Design a binder for this molecule. Structure first.
Ligand code: HEM
Ligand code: HEM
Lengths: 110, 114
């Protein structure tokens, strides 16, 4: 399908998480933004991509959205692997497929 | 299997054109942005989605980029006015990507209201 290439080669960083909040897709644009190689992210928890000072609050943000269920775009401060931070814009989408709830975040430098 | 749904249900409008500049994918978000139902766009030249006063010049920019061979698209980087079916205008932000697949060059535009 042309849809995989469309996201894989996208100029926007793309991060897809499964029902268990594990990262299942992390494109090259995302690698550049975070400073992580997909090999260090795929299969691991979304928690590793969340800024350290937000790790305490982010889990509940996701949990609450999953149970009781959307899309929104706003600027967020991203923390890279090396600790440096950059402002970006996130376009978050809730994706329902085959009875499961996934989330795709499309990211752009800001 | 999840890549299609991820774009189909995306909050961002998505427009995919093939090697002949014809629209092969136009999601619901794009329907809302432009005011066209996807069935009205599929198979047509991207020209119908371009503001009327820009239609004469836009084709050459796509052609030039295709002939260029560069991986990243640098243009359409700032806020642009999108013309809806009813003729009204709305400010938007485009994220243009050149997609190489099947030995062909496609373009995917991700759009949001700005
Ligand atoms: C640089 C990394 C990230 C930061 C700083 C961040 C920050 C936040 C913040 C502050 C919220 C609270 C809602 C609001 O914006 O007011 C939130 C909610 C959320 N985030 Fe993230 N996030 C990041 C990455 C991700 C990723 C990669 C995913 C998954 C693909 C994700 C999924 C969600 C979900 C599902 C919610 C709940 C949305 C809702 O309330 O409807 N986030 N995030
Ligand atoms: C609201 C509709 C649209 C408007 C107003 C618009 C406007 C423009 C303008 C003014 C340029 C030339 C200046 C620049 O590079 O910034 C341009 C270039 C271009 N546009 Fe569009 N466009 C629209 C939709 C699209 C769509 C749907 C596609 C394809 C999926 C597309 C693909 C391109 C390409 C490939 C270029 C050449 C850019 C480069 O060489 O870097 N445009 N567009």
């Amino acid at each position: 399908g042309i849809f995989f290439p469309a996201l894989e080669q996208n100029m926007m960083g793309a991060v897809l998480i499964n029902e268990n909040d594990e990262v299942m897709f992390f494109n090259p644009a995302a690698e550049k933004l975070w400073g992580y190689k997909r090999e260090e992210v795929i299969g691991n928890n979304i928690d590793m991509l969340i800024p350290r000072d937000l790790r305490p609050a982010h889990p509940e943000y996701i949990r609450h959205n999953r149970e009781g269920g959307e899309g929104m775009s706003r600027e967020l401060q991203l923390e890279k692997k090396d600790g440096s931070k950059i402002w970006t814009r996130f376009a978050l989408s809730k994706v329902s497929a085959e009875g499961k709830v996934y989330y795709l975040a499309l990211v752009r430098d800001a």
